[PDB]
Each structure stands twice: as structure tokens, then as C-alpha cells.
Design a protein around this motif. Sequence first.
Motif, PDB file in Angstrom:
ATOM      1  N   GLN B 359      50.910   9.371  79.575  1.00 12.82           N
ATOM      2  CA  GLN B 359      51.495   8.053  79.425  1.00 12.82           C
ATOM      3  C   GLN B 359      53.012   8.143  79.494  1.00 12.82           C
ATOM      4  N   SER B 362      55.152   5.120  74.116  1.00 10.41           N
ATOM      5  CA  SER B 362      54.430   4.251  73.205  1.00 10.41           C
ATOM      6  C   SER B 362      55.347   3.147  72.708  1.00 10.41           C
ATOM      7  N   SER B 364      55.408  -0.557  70.097  1.00 10.45           N
ATOM      8  CA  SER B 364      54.750  -1.231  68.990  1.00 10.45           C
ATOM      9  C   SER B 364      54.066  -2.501  69.472  1.00 10.45           C
ATOM     10  N   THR B 365      53.002  -2.894  68.776  1.00  7.21           N
ATOM     11  CA  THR B 365      52.194  -4.032  69.185  1.00  7.21           C
ATOM     12  C   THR B 365      52.133  -5.144  68.150  1.00  7.21           C
ATOM     13  N   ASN B 366      52.614  -4.917  66.934  1.00 11.97           N
ATOM     14  CA  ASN B 366      52.473  -5.906  65.878  1.00 11.97           C
ATOM     15  C   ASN B 366      53.738  -5.915  65.036  1.00 11.97           C
ATOM     16  N   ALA B 375      51.573  -0.610  64.257  1.00 12.15           N
ATOM     17  CA  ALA B 375      50.637  -0.130  65.261  1.00 12.15           C
ATOM     18  C   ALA B 375      51.342   0.001  66.599  1.00 12.15           C
ATOM     19  N   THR B 376      51.020   1.064  67.328  1.00  6.46           N
ATOM     20  CA  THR B 376      51.603   1.317  68.633  1.00  6.46           C
ATOM     21  C   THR B 376      50.497   1.519  69.656  1.00  6.46           C
ATOM     22  N   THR B 377      50.883   1.484  70.925  1.00  5.88           N
ATOM     23  CA  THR B 377      49.952   1.707  72.019  1.00  5.88           C
ATOM     24  C   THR B 377      50.653   2.460  73.135  1.00  5.88           C
ATOM     25  N   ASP B 378      49.861   3.155  73.945  1.00  3.56           N
ATOM     26  CA  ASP B 378      50.419   3.932  75.040  1.00  3.56           C
ATOM     27  C   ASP B 378      50.740   3.043  76.231  1.00  3.56           C
ATOM     28  N   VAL B 379      51.760   3.439  76.978  1.00  3.46           N
ATOM     29  CA  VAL B 379      52.192   2.734  78.174  1.00  3.46           C
ATOM     30  C   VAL B 379      51.772   3.576  79.366  1.00  3.46           C
ATOM     31  N   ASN B 380      50.787   3.100  80.115  1.00  2.17           N
ATOM     32  CA  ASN B 380      50.258   3.834  81.253  1.00  2.17           C
ATOM     33  C   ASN B 380      50.917   3.452  82.566  1.00  2.17           C
TER      34      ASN B 380
END
Lengths: 61, 519, 61
Positions: B359, B362, B364-366, B375-380
Motif C-alpha cells: 500500500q 495509511s 484515518s477514517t473517523n 481508525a485507519t485504512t490502507d491506501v492502495n
Amino acid sequence: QGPIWAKIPHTDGHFHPSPLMGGFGLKHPPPQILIKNTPVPANPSTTFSAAKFASFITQYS
Amino acid sequence: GADGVGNSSGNWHCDSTWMGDRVITTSTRTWALPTYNNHLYKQISSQSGASNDNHYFGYSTPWGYFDFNRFHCHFSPRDWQRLINNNWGFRPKRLNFKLFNIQVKEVTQNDGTTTIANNLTSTVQVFTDSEYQLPYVLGSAHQGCLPPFPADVFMVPQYGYLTLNNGSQAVGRSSFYCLEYFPSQMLRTGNNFTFSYTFEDVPFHSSYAHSQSLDRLMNPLIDQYLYYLSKTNAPSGTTTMSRLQFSQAGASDIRDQSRNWLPGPCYRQQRVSKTAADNNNSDYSWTGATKYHLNGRDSLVNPGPAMASHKDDEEKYFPQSGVLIFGKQDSGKTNVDIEKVMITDEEEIRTTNPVATEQYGSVSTNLQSGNTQAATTDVNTQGVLPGMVWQDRDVYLQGPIWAKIPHTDGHFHPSPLMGGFGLKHPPPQILIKNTPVPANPSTTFSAAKFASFITQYSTGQVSVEIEWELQKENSKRWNPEIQYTSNYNKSVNVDFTVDTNGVYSEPRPIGTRYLTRNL
Amino acid sequence: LDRLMNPLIDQYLYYLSKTNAPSGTTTMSRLQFSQAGASDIRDQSRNWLPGPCYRQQRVSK
């Protein structure tokens, strides 16, 4: 109290090369200025030795 | 230039000249040109049962074309070594092309026995598409270029193109080009054809690797005067409480330093291993592939944006469709094993470009709060951002050289994704054809078009000379650098030579990035 | 011709000085190297050789 400039990395591509911490992006920024005290060896031995010197006069500028 | 039958219309020029910051490479080959399509234009289209992703519509012409869009058409292996070991960059400057010593020969197939004879009066037609009015088919990595070994004779490839299609059918917007509708020069044996061309300004290709990493540019001895958030809670009596704390980044926490730049963009690919046992036991060559969607069709992204092939200590891995893959000598066309191909590696750019199979990062999402954790998420996939820097894909001795930039309203960083130089006015296409010679006609008039011709082909020599501008390195590095070299140990064959049967072969792909440079 | 060095400074080149070393109550083959000085002047590396020869018989007065 923030930075002024930053050197743009020498790469194939870059987009809007203004440094992210703020300031001016330069391909040829103001050059670095290096300075050093010239070492002055202490009292050497009277018989030759090929080992490099390790005792110097303590000094600053 | 023009003279009789017994006069050569040109000489054999093939060598390289190094002078200061220029290098001039000239090469000569002998070619053979058949009669394609039996002198006809033909509409071609995809099969009726083909999948929607594989539909096409177009035409095939009776013309051939000359192609020298691979580096090994101009550089010998020794010349390529000179280039990549001593220069930080290079680029083409101007070009000279020449066609000479044409011979047309007629074939007679009486009784299974072939007889070949000269046809001194027949001719060939040649023209250069200097105004870019035909569909440009160079720059698609097709076969049929000049051979790498000067002693090889090659067949001229046939010209054809595709236009707009709706499934297997065409639309009103699709266009048809008759190549006889161009002024072309007709040559008999004893005529020659030349032209010249000047490359537009393009940036030097970066023939270096960075000796620094994008995330390691600080002075490891001095702390920053900026602060970062280092702790979000602190111990209370037998418990903790939310409490923000800040620190100045140094060498011990180098990952937290404030920085001015960001790595290049990303478009994530699937990872496969050269060891067979590591890969999944299934057919994911298309389902697991990364593709783009255009007008309802899916198209494989190959090789795509330039990203590092792997991280350190992981040479066994490579992106599924993110690297150029050349074939070894005499390898087949379809479903060959991995031992028959040569997989390139783009690891030199992992100092600025992200790894193709990871990826980008990352985010944050919230919004964290007293009763909500962060909360975090990966950036593809990451498009370009202000402050990004990156390198382009490397070029190889047997890879392409240039590509025509599509004539559009907008484009971003128009360097071709397979590597090389993007040109708005690339070297023009050079079309060639044998003039048809009708066979014995009837003695009573008939308005039907002719359908019986004399079987014949042509041959001759072709030469191309290119001037390249060099960019010399000016490094103050103390320790020696990495250079491309041959191994000294004994072997049955020498690399980049012929074998006992006369087959020239290139044992490995050779990039350009050996010298180093500071970031 | 064999005495052209500075007798005060050792060479930075090495020569093979011993081919065996003592083991327990015995010896073993073991190469050892030394830098030539004045004490072992016969072992110094040199740049030239003496002139040619064609041996004759010796007689006494």
C-alpha cells in the motif's frame, strides 16, 4: 520562526515542488557552508612511527 | 543520387564514435520485403465469439514499414557498457536514414521448382509520414525491428491499424486510410532514398540510482526544532488519563521527523514469487490482475506506473504485471515456463517510488473521541499530490526508445510507461511497398480490376545514424561505484556472442542505473 | 646495488619469513609474513638486478 527554503530533490518528476513544511523550493538553493579547525598535532616521538597521529592540541575557534 | 545497374547506390556504415559529450551510432542491415495481402487492402475485425474485452476493428494494408525503436538496434553490448558506466544521462539529438542497393526479384513456381530472377525495371515505393497523418503504430513494442546482430537479415513487417469499433462492427466515426493517397518516391535498382530528422528537446534519461532515501535526508546528529505528538495518554493512579505530550524528533525516533516531500504515486499490483511453491494453486492471471476500465472494456495495466519491484531481501518476488519481461533466445510464443523469460527488476527506484505490491500508506477514517478509538485504512491507489517526487522506469538495451505522445487536450508527465522518451513529433513512420506488376492480360477489354500479378519480392540495405547527447557525471564520492561487468569464470559460451550453430543471443537484460547520485 | 634503501624506515611490503610454526611438541606448516627492515636487510624488495654472468675458474697468486 519557520524555515525559509528547501532543496528540490534531483529526480525525474515532481509536482508543485513547494516544500511541505512551507517556504520556497529551489533547484539550486543557497549552498552549504562547511567549516573546521585544522588539527594541530601534539609533541611527536623522536623515532619514526608510521601509525597515524592520535594526540592533538585541544583547541577551538 | 541515381545511376545504372552496375553501380552500388551506397556503402556499409556501421560503427560508433565517441567525442566529448556526443556519441554517434550508425548501423546497417539487409532487409527483405515480400508482397503482403496480395496487393490488397483488407478490413479485419475480431472473431465473432471473442470476449468483449478483445473486440477490435481495423484494416491491413499491402505496405511494410521500417522500425528501429529498440536500443540494441544502435548500441553494441560493449557500447552500451561504455554508456551506462560513465554517464548520468543521455538523449537523442538528430537522425539520418538511408535506403539503398534495392534489388527486385521475380519468382516462378513451375512444377514445384522455384526459379528466381532479377526484374531490372520493377520498382518499390517509399515515403515518410512526416506530417503524422497516419495512425502511429510504432511505440507498441512490436516485433520486426532491426536485428541486434549486424549480420542478421530481417523481414520487413506489415502495416496495419485499428480504428473505432462497436463490438465486432465499426461506427460512422471510424476512419479508413489509403496509403496510395500519399506522394511517394519510386525507386528502381540504382536509386536510393534518404532523409533527416531532428529530435525535439527532451529531458535526459536518468542513468543513475539515488544513494539516499527519501525518508532519510536529515542530519542524524542534530534534533529538529519542531515537535510532534508522541504520547496521547499518561499514567494516573493505577490507571491512565488522556493527556497530549510532544517531543522533538532525533535519530532515536527518526521515523517521526517532519519532512518536505512525499513518495511518488501508486497503483497497487499483485505479488508473485519466482519460487513455484510460494504462489497460490489457482488461475488468478486475469481475476487477480490490475486493470483499467475504458468504454465498458477491461484492459490489463502493463507495466503501469513506475514502482519498485520489491523491497530489500525479497528478490524472489515481483509484481504480477508491473515489470518488462523479455524472452530468452528461441523461446516460444504461448505459455512458456519461467525459465524461458528474463524478468526485469526496478529496485533502484525504491528510494523514491513505493513498492508496487504494498500500500502507499495509511489514512484515518473517523474522528476519535472519549468513546471512539481512532481508525485507519490502507491506501492502495494514490494520485499525485503537491510535494511528490519520483523516478521513471529504466530503459534497457533491448527495450523501446521513444513513443508518440497522444494528441489530446491534457496529459501529465508524458514519459511513456514502458520507458523511454515521449515525443510530440517522434521520428516519422517509413512505409515501403513493391509496385504491383500485372501478369498477361486478356486481348479483349474487361473493366474488372486486375487480379493476376507477377510474384515478386525485393531486398536491399538500410542504414540509420543517430547522434546522442551525453551528460557526464561529476561525483565527489570517495569509494568506488557499481559497474556493469562480465564474469571472469570459464563457460561454454561467451555472453552476447554466437553459439556453435551461429545463433546470436542476449543472456540477460541490461538497465542503465549503475552510477549513483545524491537525492 | 643491494644496499640502496633507507636503513631507518621499514618497507610497507611483506615477504614470507617462516613456513612452519611450533605445535604441541612438533611443528605444522604455516605461512608467516614480515616487513623487512635493517635487521633483515637481505630480504628487502628491490627494483634492480646485477649484471649478467659467465662463470670462470679461480686461480690464486
